[PDB]
Amino acid sequence: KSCCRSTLGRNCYNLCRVRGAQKLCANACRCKLTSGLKCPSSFPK
Amino acid sequence: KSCCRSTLGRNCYNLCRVRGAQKLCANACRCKLTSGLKCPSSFPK
Ligand SMILES: Cc1ccc(S(=O)(=O)O)cc1
Ligand SMILES: Cc1ccc(S(=O)(=O)O)cc1
């Protein structure tokens, strides 16, 4: 599951993932990857 | 040429670009593409 800081970070991640892998795009867009079922509140998007 | 707003934006763009195209990564990372050789001072990174 990806968890991003803001809507800007979410649109970064989703566009990046068109060609890019999860870990690569999480680091580019400052999102968090988690195996949890919900995101922490600091990374809600 | 790619022109980014910040160091974080440049990092974003460079990572995205490992597998993504220029236009897509510029949109994701909020950078601008220019045909010229000078970046707008608003997009200096
Ligand atoms: C392009 C972009 C802008 C801002 C962020 S954020 O500050 O991590 O939400 C991530 C990605
Ligand atoms: C991750 C990240 C944070 C912030 C930006 S920027 O606001 O476009 O400089 C781009 C990318």
Curated annotation (Swiss-Prot), chains A, B:
Chain's role: Thionins are small plant proteins which are toxic to animal cells. They seem to exert their toxic effect at the level of the cell membrane. Their precise function is not known.
SUBUNIT field: Homodimer.
Annotated disulfide bonds: 3-39, 4-31, 12-29, 16-25
Name assigned to this protein: Beta-hordothionin
Encoding gene per record: THI1.2
Protein's cellular compartments: Secreted
Family affiliation: Belongs to the plant thionin (TC 1.C.44) family. 4 C-C subfamily.
Coiled coil: none
Native species: Hordeum vulgare
